[PDB]
Structures are given as C-alpha cells and as structure tokens.
Amino acid sequence: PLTKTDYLMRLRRCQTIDTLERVIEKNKYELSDNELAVFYSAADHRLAELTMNKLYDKIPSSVWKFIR
Amino acid sequence: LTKTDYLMRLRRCQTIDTLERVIEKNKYELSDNELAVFYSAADHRLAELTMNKLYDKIPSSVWKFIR
Amino acid sequence: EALKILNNIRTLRAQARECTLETLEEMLEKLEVVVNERREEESA
Amino acid sequence: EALKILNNIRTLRAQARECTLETLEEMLEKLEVVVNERREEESA
C-alpha cells in the first residue's frame, strides 16, 4: 500500500498552505478513506514543516503545539 | 448518563463472564452515542474485576493485563 | 464527540491491527500533545 | 476504523475539547499500552 513518505513527496511541493488547504480538500473527496489516514500524516507533517519554514525528516513533539 | 452511573451498575457484576454477558447484551441495545460512555465504565469494571481490586481511578499498569 | 468512541481498550486493539506501527506512534504523539495541552489548561 | 481522526492534529484538539480531561487521560494511557504491545509484536 501507499506509505506516508510517498504522499509527503508530492505535498512537499505544496506551498503557502492556501494551496495545501486546497490540495487536502481536493484529496479528501476521492480519497481512499483508509489510506487517507496515511495521507493525513503527510498533511500534518507538511503543515508542520511549513508553519515553521524548516524541513523535518521526523517531526519533533515540540512543534505540534504551534499548529492552529 | 455518566460513567460512574454505569460503573455503579456494573459494579454489581461478578466473575467477568457475567460482565461479558451484560456487556454483550448492551452492545446491541444501547444508544451508540450513549454506548461509548458505557464502554468507559465497562473497561473500568473489567479491569477492577481482572485484578480483584476496586479502583476509583484505574492505574496505567493494569491495562496490559486486560484480555 | 466521535473521538470518545476510542476510549475502548478492546476496540482500540481492533482498529489498531490494520494500522502500521509507525503511524501508531504519530497518533500517540499527536494525542499526548493534546492532553498535555489540557493538563496545563484545565488542571493547571 | 475511526482512527483516521486521531492522526489529524487540528480536529483532534477540537473533538478533545468536547471530551473531559479525566477520560482523555484514560484514552491516552489506553493508547500508550496498545502501541507498546505492537513494539514487541513486530520487533527485531
């Protein structure tokens, strides 16, 4: 099955969140639902490393607090 | 209804097998939205029945022993 | 709301079988972050 | 199952507000136990 890193590859390109909110919105409808669980990890990851302008391989526990 | 309320009722239950039975009967009859809170009391009772001690709040240690 | 359904240790295991371990750690880390936010808020 | 909500930080906070803290603690300690169990399972 598709893994989180794969989704993250594509989402790494998604910039300024507004585009991300759009891409996540575009995904949710048509998404596998079960796979969506893996995709959500990439959404949060990317959103995390975008809110902070740093690129993490693994998101630190410290970072999650800053998400809106 | 609150969890303690369900826990009061389930507190009467003995020998786990009887609890499994009441829990089994509840699954198909309950409000679903309400059922979730019953599950909280159900775990509590089963825990405190698994160990033969009555905890007001369940210690993290016991959850491993649950079947 | 519908988060409350997860407070069932048997059902937690069930739904857990179909998730891989590396995701489980993320969910857990998501969660503790959330309750730590309330431990400070509510309790403190 | 309904776990997909758990790995989504935004709504996770939200739906957590509508639950009490004393349950959140229960759920978390429940979750932590479950994930610890697969660590041994997979292993090596």
UniProtKB/Swiss-Prot annotation, chain A:
Q: Which SUPFAM superfamilies match?
A: Hemolysin expression modulating protein HHA
The annotated subunit structure for this chain is: Interacts with H-NS; crystal structures suggest each subunit of an H-NS dimer could bind 1 Hha monomer.
Q: Could you tell me what this protein does? A: Interacts with H-NS and in this complex might contact DNA, which could provide an additional surface for DNA binding to the H-NS-Hha complex; may not bind DNA in the absence of H-NS. In vitro improves the ability of H-NS to bind DNA under a precise set of conditions.
Its keywords, alphabetically, are:
Transcription, Transcription regulation
Q: Upon deletion of the gene, what happens?
A: Derepression of genes that are usually coregulated by H-NS and Hha.
The record, for Pfam families, names: HHA (PF05321)
The family classification in the record reads: Belongs to the Hha/YmoA/Cnu family.
Q: From which source organism is this entry?
A: Salmonella typhimurium (strain LT2 / SGSC1412 / ATCC 700720)
Name by which UniProt lists this protein: Hemolysin expression-modulating protein Hha
Swiss-Prot record, chains C, D:
Residue ranges of the TM segments: none
What positions belong to coiled-coil segments?
A: 20-44
One biological process term from GO is: negative regulation of DNA-templated transcription
Q: From the UniProt record, which GO molecular function terms apply?
A: bent DNA binding; DNA binding; DNA-binding transcription repressor activity; identical protein binding; minor groove of adenine-thymine-rich DNA binding; protein dimerization activity; structural constituent of chromatin; transcription cis-regulatory region binding
- Could you list this entry's UniProt keywords, alphabetically sorted: Coiled coil, Cytoplasm, DNA-binding, Repressor, Transcription, Transcription regulation
Q: Where is this site: Interacts with Hha?
A: R10
Its subcellular locations are: Cytoplasm, Nucleoid
Q: Name one GO cellular component term.
A: cytosol
Q: Does the keyword Lyase apply?
A: no
Tell me the segments the record calls region Responsible for protein oligomerization: 1-44
Phenotype of the disrupted gene, per the record:
Loss of osmotic regulation of the proU locus, loss of changes in plasmid linking number. 2X decreased growth rate, which is partially restored by a mutation preventing expression of SPI2, increased expression of about half of the genes to which H-NS binds. Note strain LT2 has point mutation in rpoS which decreases its translation efficiency, in the presence of wild-type rpoS, deletion of hns is lethal. Leads to the expression of genes encoding virulence proteins in normally non-inducing conditions.
Known outcome of mutating R10A:
No longer binds Hha, still able to bind YdgT
Quaternary structure?
Answer: Forms oligomers of increasing size with increasing protein concentration. The fragment of 1-83 probably forms oligomers of 4 dimeric units at 10 degrees Celsius, at 40 degrees Celsius only dimers are formed. Binds Hha and YdgT (also known as cnu); crystal structures suggest each H-NS dimer could bind 2 Hha monomers on opposites sides. Probably also binds StpA.
Task: Briefly state the protein's biological role.
Answer: Acts as a global transcriptional repressor and binds to the minor groove of AT-rich DNA. Silences genes by altering DNA topology; in magnesium concentrations equivalent to inside Salmonella-containing vacuoles (SCV) it forms rigid and elongated filaments on the DNA, and in higher magnesium conditions it causes DNA bridging/folding.
In the record, the note on similarity to other proteins reads: Belongs to the histone-like protein H-NS family.
Show the domain comment: Composed of 2 domains (approximately residues 1-64 and 89-136) joined by a flexible linker. The isolated N-terminus (1-64) forms a trimer, probably via coiled-coil interactions. The isolated N-terminus plus linker fragment (residues 1-89) forms homooligomers of increasing size with increasing protein concentration, while the isolated C-terminus fragment is a monomer. A shorter fragment (residues 1-46) interacts with Hha.
What is the protein's name according to its record? DNA-binding protein H-NS
Q: Which organism is it from?
A: Salmonella typhimurium (strain LT2 / SGSC1412 / ATCC 700720)
Residues of the whole record sequence present? 3 to 46 of 137
